[PDB]
Design a protein around this ligand. Structure first.
Ligand code: HEC
Ligand code: HEC
Ligand code: HEC
Ligand code: HEC
Ligand code: CA
Ligand code: CA
Ligand code: NA
Ligand code: NA
Ligand code: NA
Ligand code: NA
Lengths: 126, 354, 376, 376, 125, 354
């Protein structure tokens, strides 16, 4: 893979960094440490905060907002690490910024990063 | 039958002969010109509505009927969460079970009983015709049948496209007909990433075919009593509105103080806000949420009064996991949310946005 | 042939297409069963470490547990809990040391106990499974102390409290046989039986010396607590077997994992967990390769399988990777687990044919220790 | 030709032959100088992390410092101390959080202060140098807080105590210009000047808006406190230069770091620390490559150099590796440091010719941040 | 390269795992993180415990006792990891056993492992 | 000088005419049959020696002269550590400076002054011949010269092969001539991996040419007063033996309580042990070190008394960094250290080992 080429999404393998919902993920895919595409691994705490991105779904042609909520309270999983930045903006536009640990709202005030989930939260307005 | 039944409901909806002194119809409190809400000033401003006797005030704010027909019938989901129903406390199962209640409520339309209602229906030759072609001969001579039929017709009218047109700017944008302004688009983004989406979107994940900006769940967000409204309703200084727990058959004390999440469609034009009409301005309703997140002193003060928000009417069962998000909305994000929420106004109420 | 990621992509697409909602939440691991396998990553002496919980049948990570410096994992054989003895410091690898035991629920992985061990008593060594051990009832955890002298600490998991340190002779490892008794291997080449009450010096009895002083017994013997079988290879693949089942140690005839000709041609065991033992089949598995005599911690590419009663060779598997540790599931038709520290990968083989079935990669920095429960 | 390891073997063998004795001890790092460079490894969000102290002239690791979760390193410009703001937890990555600042001696690397920050106030983010900053007199450390709202904490390094949090507007990063003043970049496109040299409320003033809402100013601008120069690239390689030397912000014309033909042919900056600034030479260096518009955090293989005063291009170097971050030494004939996160290697280059001189590999797990002192 | 082949010591580079004095080292060479062949990096604490091995010096053909000592109190350096086991014996012969963290005696009770030094303490005989 | 000079010292060394009452020579307290130490029993056992007057006891134990010639002259090294010299407190710079002191010490050989010493030398025709051949005619008529010459001869004698023969089992094994027993081999291994090697080896690293199992440094290992020897010396119950701080010109309070690391050569035959002879048995000397490492009750108890060791005479400046090693010697390792230390006995004393 040319790292500088335009990123190309697929809808056939959620553990790969070009899976379409991971278009602005930073960290690790939760499905690789005992969570799933939209659930956290046992023992971790699910944040309510997230960064978002509009990600195109090559299965149906639609663009969906994905809320990258973190699973927190564990050291980083080290499995399936990915970093994509489709639409990703600097820190002063934090809703689109993905270097921030989005662990706010997690139970037990957990704030360490373990992995990110990729749920759809609505339709893109663009 | 479908069109016809809804047509009968349309007539009943605006007919003040369904009130004891004949001064009020559904449309008096649920005024079509105001997104089906009550424009009339009472002892507590617009917070609660006055009934047909011209003196009795309710204790809750009159909600829009717009999009009420999208709410599921009342039930408990597999996670033990109550959802759906009608009234701010869910105590009616659906629109049909709700419809007869204001007719018989002495603080609203105030008819003494079902037989009184049937008698007014029978007075009108047009009702004899219209009820009998839908429900059979003699339906109006049987108070139980007449009242059940009137409720059915009103429920059918409320299920028409008129009440739920899906033609707001939000809808046009999502159909790709136009774009949000930058401020609106930023408000949509905030609304979606911040804690509002835990409560004010139909689904936990995925997308809704007919989104109405509520998950139909019951939450206690820890509002104070609206003092002028509570004084006007006469319920007493020692009254507590227990919300969902007041539904008969609900016994779990963990439901005390929880109210149905309202749809945010037409919110910009249906002030004042919350179950008791306590906040006049949409921006105040949005700012109330910072009392759970902000560390600035101003966050503890209701900007409409200059006093603290107030102790919650029911200080237990608050939805803290959702409300204590860890993040404070700055004034720019509050501006953005107001802009985004104004895009949920049906086309016919756009001119009201001033 | 469809991968787990591919299956999950189709399910997620089907839910999206169907308009199916589902609440994002914290998953539970599936119930412990015979094919669950735990891989611990001591991470080449890093101050913090990880353990991976794996469904060996699916080849899937089903959970993880964080640990401190060189922690010692244990797994209840009935599946009812897992636990570890761990060490943390107030400023990463410097400052006040705290040693402690956590017990976790094997489904939510939440800690159900966190039991401080006073005076930083743990032995900090490259991880040896039998340097910390559960009693057969699951109620007591015993851990080894080296400094200032060999000692064994007694931790009451039921009462959630550290009890006391026991004075023992110059001995090593801990093989429990009852609620109050365990065995150790001593410098002098005997085993020591240690029986302890609620107070006093333990009653200590030694066996006969069962090995010469220039025969070297590896740091990773296999010990089946349910069989009472201790399987102890030497550097040349001679295997000592000790039957603790009666309550006292009885030495079984020695068997050789390699032939005289193979040993003369350079064949020796090597790795980390070099030996596994399947209880129901009464079978020994030994990681072996051709190597110089002092390359005994390097990986090996072959596994020999032999009948524990007769010493007959049943199978010799070419593993097809650089393997450092092996273990097996304890069910019928077992899996043979083959962990590569260098690849950070657990390879999962059919124990009867030796065929590689599936593998789980990205297991930390330097994974070394495989543990399974014996649930049968 | 002769490597460091070879020269050390030659010397040891000579000492042996000659019978020269020497006492095994703790070494001191050599005195801070202009060619000392620090590399911080945020370790792709691991709960513990490392910083490497390197002699850029020899290409040698001269020391290390441990840190906790996503620490923010700072280096006093005069070489007198280094410090970080760091975060630890009572059980690895879970349990009670403690945020703290440590100050270290730059030769013994021993902590000379450890100052707890109440209520776990640090912002946890991929590491941005100007999210924690020293005032020019070295007496104060300022750190950013994001939750519940943008805020800035003040730590007194001389009295070794946390002082207070400053409420600020919706702004980001911290560029100190005086013992009592720093600037931040606000969402609205202005800068905010914050004068805080009192226990009372700070005086906050905004500059004019200096960029439009669709230009995106990167997370890693270069700031020279001694020059009062803030060099702020956008995603397209437009460079905003802000002269803060009078104590107030003066905005220079924004120049393009990439040529007209380069921008037409897909060139854009990209990586982590994408920009460096040499004060004495008044030169800007920017990491660039051909890339899609949304691959802005990927490595780049070229560095363009331009005269900050005239905007003239001076050089374009082909770096020969996948480079994420760059910086320069601040002495007369500087080094250009080029850090690969993927190779975990620091490439050390001659800044004038761009030629690779030497490299330092094995720098942790995902090293990202280079810092140097401006000692002249 | 062949990990199982007999280890071949050299006397030309101390940062490589086949340097003669590292014949039973386990961990990381301190020269690679700011120490030297026989000194610890700044900030770390020099232990007094050791495990010992007889290492052949190819230069003079003599064997020397190397008493390995750890530099302690820092997370593992991660630079120049090596594991050799010439004459290394199991844990019940602790003086020749190298999976043990030999940090005993280190100042400030430091017991985390950072790197190992390789000093000579005697001729082997 | 050389040969003839040492032969003159040899005669002086065994001559009781250098003591006032002619009862004692160097060899009376440094008896060559007992590795140059004192077999005589005064009022405190063998702990301290009795002078020529038959009554005066010293306060320190008489050390072996074997291998004393390998000690460097007293100096401060660049690392701030004092090293070398003679006496347990280093107050003599070298053997030559040491040699005259017992002759004039009233508690030892008790000659009144140099003049009285020269008069004794003059009395013996063999000394007139031997001193005059080496130092010139009339040397013995000049008390300053006669005294200095006597010291020179004594130091030269002590530097001969007789005093430092390097023919112990340890030396033979290092030469490849035989092997240690397994127990001696284990002891050697412990000695070189445990804290002993930090003080009782010549070099920090590398290989020593003529190892004498001391680094010649000064340490306070925290020994208690020897009560019976202290009573016998008459120095008083309030006395404190400050070790190196008592050397003239040392003023640094950090040197209080520190003593020279003794060579362990011949240690098995030169009991009792330590600067004050407090422990009779070699096993006890080794067990003393466990007081800093073992938490067992028995580690606090002197096995020779059944009572606690006692507080240090000087409870400051203890070498805790070396002594608090974190590991205790079990009985097996103590047994092995004894076997190892016995291999440091010169061949001519091997028969004394039982
Ligand atoms: C005097 C004013 C008044 C009149 C007349 C009135 N309503 Fe209401 N309406 C209310 C108030 C107040 C509520 C909130 C009551 C509560 O939650 O207990 C309400 C609630 C409802 C709801 C529940 C909607 C929701 O979101 O929970 C429906 C449906 C409804 N009205 C329909 C009707 C119909 C149909 C009629 C005529 C038969 C009618 N109303 C007459 C004041 C009135
Ligand atoms: C925890 C669930 C929950 C969260 C989170 C939440 N709301 Fe609400 N919202 C409610 C409920 C329940 C009500 C009605 C409360 C009542 O009247 O008792 C409400 C009422 C409102 C109203 C008044 C509607 C009306 O018709 O009176 C507005 C406006 C509103 N919410 C906006 C928001 C915004 C914007 C956010 C994000 C800052 C938000 N809410 C977060 C549950 C929530
Ligand atoms: C009455 C006993 C006695 C006599 C006689 C005596 N010594 Fe000593 N010797 C001692 C004692 C006691 C010490 C230790 C004194 C101290 O450290 O302050 C000592 C120490 C020494 C030392 C220092 C050795 C070391 O390791 O520190 C030398 C050298 C020495 N004696 C040589 C001599 C010579 C030469 C003579 C004859 C001129 C002599 N001694 C006579 C008792 C005696
Ligand atoms: C910190 C330095 C240091 C260490 C470590 C040390 N020693 Fe010593 N040793 C001394 C000094 C100093 C003396 C003399 C103390 C005194 O008498 O005041 C001594 C005395 C002895 C003696 C008595 C010798 C004599 O002639 O009286 C023996 C035996 C001895 N040590 C053995 C050991 C052994 C075995 C070990 C390791 C277990 C050891 N030492 C560790 C410094 C040390
Ligand atoms: Ca309203
Ligand atoms: Ca003695
Ligand atoms: Na009011
Ligand atoms: Na009820
Ligand atoms: Na005595
Ligand atoms: Na003095």
């Amino acid at each position: 893979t040319d790292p500088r080429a335009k990123w190309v999404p697929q809808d056939n393998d959620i553990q790969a960094c070009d899976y379409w919902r991971h278009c602005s993920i930073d960290g690790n895919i939760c499905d690789c440490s005992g969570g799933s595409l939209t659930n956290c691994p046992p023992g971790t705490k699910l944040a309510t905060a997230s960064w978002v991105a509009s990600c195109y779904n090559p299965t149906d042609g639609q663009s969906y907002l994905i809320a990258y909520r973190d699973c927190c309270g564990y050291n980083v999983s080290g499995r399936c690490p990915c970093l994509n930045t489709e639409g990703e903006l600097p820190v002063y536009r934090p809703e689109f910024a993905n270097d921030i640990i989005w662990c706010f709202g997690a139970e037990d005030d957990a704030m360490t990063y373990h992995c990110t989930i990729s749920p759809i939260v609505g339709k893109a307005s663009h | 039958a479908d069109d016809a039944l809804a047509a009968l409901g349309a007539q009943l909806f605006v007919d003040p002969a369904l009130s004891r002194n004949a001064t009020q119809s559904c449309a008096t409190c649920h005024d079509p010109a105001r997104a089906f809400t009550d424009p009339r000033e009472g002892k507590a401003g617009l917070a609660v509505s006055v009934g047909d006797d011209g003196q009795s005030h309710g204790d809750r704010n009159t909600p829009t009927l717009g999009y009420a027909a999208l709410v599921p019938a009342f039930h408990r989901d597999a996670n033990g969460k109550y959802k759906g129903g009608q009234f701010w406390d869910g105590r009616a199962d659906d629109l049909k079970q709700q419809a007869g209640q204001p007719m018989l409520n002495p603080v609203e339309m105030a008819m003494p009983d079902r037989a009184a209602v049937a008698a007014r229906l029978r007075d009108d030759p047009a009702y004899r015709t219209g009820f009998e072609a839908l429900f059979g001969k003699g339906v109006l001579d049987d108070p139980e049948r007449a009242f059940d039929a009137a409720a059915e017709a009103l429920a059918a009218y409320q299920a028409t496209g008129e009440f739920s047109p899906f033609d707001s700017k939000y809808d046009r944008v999502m159909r790709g007909e136009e774009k949000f302004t930058p401020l609106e688009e930023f408000g949509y983004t905030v609304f979606i990433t911040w804690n509002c989406r835990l409560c004010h979107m139909q689904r936990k994940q995925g997308v809704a075919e007919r989104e109405t900006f509520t998950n139909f769940e019951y939450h206690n967000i820890g509002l104070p009593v609206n003092e002028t409204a509570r004084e006007a309703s006469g319920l007493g200084a020692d009254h507590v509105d227990h919300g969902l727990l007041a539904r008969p058959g609900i016994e779990d004390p963990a439901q005390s103080g929880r109210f149905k999440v309202p749809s945010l469609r037409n919110v910009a034009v249906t002030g004042p806000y919350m179950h008791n009409g306590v906040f006049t301005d949409l921006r105040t309703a949005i700012l109330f949420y910072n009392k759970y997140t902000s560390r600035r002193p101003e966050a503890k003060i209701n900007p409409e009064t200059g006093a603290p928000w107030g102790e919650p009417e029911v200080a237990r069962n608050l939805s803290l996991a959702e409300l204590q998000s860890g993040l404070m909305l700055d004034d720019g994000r509050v501006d953005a949310l107001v802009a985004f929420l104004e895009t949920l106004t049906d086309r016919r109420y756009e001119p009201l946005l001033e | 042939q469809e991968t787990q990621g591919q299956a999950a992509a189709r399910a997620a697409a089907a839910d999206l297409a169907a308009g199916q909602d589902d609440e994002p939440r914290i998953l539970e691991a599936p119930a412990p069963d015979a094919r669950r396998v735990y891989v611990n990553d001591p991470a080449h002496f890093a101050a913090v470490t990880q353990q991976f919980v794996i469904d060996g049948e699916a080849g899937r990570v089903i959970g993880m547990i964080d640990g401190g410096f060189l922690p010692n994992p244990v797994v209840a054989d009935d599946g009812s809990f897992i636990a570890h003895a761990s060490t943390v410091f107030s400023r990463i690898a410097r400052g006040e040391r705290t040693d402690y035991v956590e017990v976790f629920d094997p489904v939510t992985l939440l800690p159900t106990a966190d039991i401080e061990l006073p005076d930083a008593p743990r032995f900090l060594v490259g991880t040896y499974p039998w340097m910390t051990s559960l009693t057969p009832d699951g109620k007591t955890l015993l851990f080894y102390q080296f400094s200032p002298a060999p000692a064994v600490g007694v931790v009451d998991l039921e009462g959630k409290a550290f009890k006391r340190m026991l004075d023992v002779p110059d001995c090593y490892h801990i093989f429990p046989t009852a609620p109050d008794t365990f065995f150790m291997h001593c410098r002098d080449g005997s085993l020591a039986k240690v029986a302890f009450g609620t107070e006093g010096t333990p009653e200590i009895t030694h066996t006969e010396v069962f090995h010469p002083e220039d025969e070297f017994l590896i740091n990773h013997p296999a010990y089946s607590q349910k069989a009472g079988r201790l399987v102890w290879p030497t550097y040349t693949g001679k295997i000592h077997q000790i039957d603790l089942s009666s309550g006292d140690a009885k030495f079984l005839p020695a068997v050789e994992a390699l032939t005289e000709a193979e040993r003369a041609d350079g064949w020796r065991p090597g790795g980390w967990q070099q030996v596994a033992y399947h209880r129901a089949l009464d079978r020994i598995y030994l990681l072996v390769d051709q190597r110089d005599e002092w390359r005994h911690k390097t990986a090996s590419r072959f596994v020999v399988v032999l009948d524990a009663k007769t010493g007959e060779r049943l199978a010799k598997f070419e593993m097809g990777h650089e393997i450092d540790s092996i273990n097996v599931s304890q069910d019928e038709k077992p899996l043979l687990y083959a962990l590569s520290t260098g690849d950070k990968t657990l390879y999962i083989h059919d124990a009867e044919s030796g065929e590689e079935l599936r593998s789980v990669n990205q297991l930390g920095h330097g994974p070394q220790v495989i543990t399974t429960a014996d649930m049968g």
